Amino acid sequence: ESLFVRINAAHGFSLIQVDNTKVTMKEILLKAVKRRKGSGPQYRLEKQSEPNVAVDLDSTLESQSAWEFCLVRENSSR
């Protein structure tokens, strides 16, 4: 199996394949939004264990020390 990250969203979850942990959280967010929402409302990612705080999208997956995140509309909460 490949490595992958679990993204919990408003209407379900998505498992997002990653080649390595040097992928940025921005890349993961973009993949999750494109799959789940299609083609403007903005989104953040949150660590599963830290509600209401946006992860730095320019940081790497490795830096998060987490493999589960919530995808949250910026005008909303998880």
Partner 1 sequence: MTEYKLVVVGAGGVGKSALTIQLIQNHFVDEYDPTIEDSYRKQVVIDGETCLLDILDTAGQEEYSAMRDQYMRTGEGFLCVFAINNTKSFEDIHQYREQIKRVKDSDDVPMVLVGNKCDLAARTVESRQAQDLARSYGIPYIETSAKTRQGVEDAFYTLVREIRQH
35 forms part of the interface with partner 1 (CB under 8 A): yes
Task: Show the site string, 37-66: x = touches partner 1 by CB under 8 A, - = not.
Answer: -x----------------------------
Distance from C-alpha of 40 to C-alpha of 64, rounded to nearest angstrom: 27
Name the CA dihedral angle for 15, 49, 78, 24, rounded to a multiple of 10 degrees: -50
User: Pick from 17, 20, 59, 76: which binds partner 1 (CB under 8 A)?
Assistant: 17
Nearer to partner 1, 26 or 36 (CB): 36
Residues whose CB is less than 8 angstroms from the CB of residue 39 and which lie 6 or more positions away in sequence, other chains included: none
